[PDB]
Amino acid sequence: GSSGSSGMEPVETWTPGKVATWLRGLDDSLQDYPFEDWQLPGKNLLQLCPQSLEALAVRSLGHQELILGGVEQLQALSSRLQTENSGPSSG
């Protein structure tokens, strides 16, 4: 099925077609990289590394820090503690 911007699903589940949107937004310096081609799934987006990115023509550090940095925040919101049953309440 398809959800309508309802709920904050984990990135580890996100599809390799949405990431491109989350990557292009991060910054323009990255908007250049062929995301639509990267076809990289979320499960891999949260398990990325400075040794792999290189393969995608991402050797430069500055660019790595930009992404890797934001990913660190995702791994958190994505990796929850038995949220299925009960999770944190923001209020």
Side-chain angles (χ1 to χ4, degrees), residues 25-79:
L26 270 163
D27 271 308
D28 71 90
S29 289
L30 313 164
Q31 271 186 32
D32 173 43
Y33 282 105
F35 297 132
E36 288 209 303
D37 193 304
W38 274 29
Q39 288 189 344
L40 172 89
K43 70 175 277 201
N44 292 344
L45 177 73
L46 281 182
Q47 299 304 336
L48 270 182
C49 30
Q51 272 69 251
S52 79
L53 279 152
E54 299 172 50
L56 308 176
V58 183
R59 304 90 154 173
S60 204
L61 208 299
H63 278 151
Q64 283 166 25
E65 271 291 290
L66 286 159
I67 301 176
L68 289 173
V71 181
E72 293 210 289
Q73 270 276 264
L74 279 181
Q75 278 191 117
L77 47 87
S78 170
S79 305

Side-chain angles (χ1 to χ4, degrees), residues 5-34:
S5 294
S6 280
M8 169 37 195
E9 89 180 82
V11 179
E12 88 187 72
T13 53
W14 289 15
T15 36
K18 310 168 58 181
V19 176
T21 302
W22 184 86
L23 282 171
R24 77 90 90 179
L26 270 163
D27 271 308
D28 71 90
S29 289
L30 313 164
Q31 271 186 32
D32 173 43
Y33 282 105

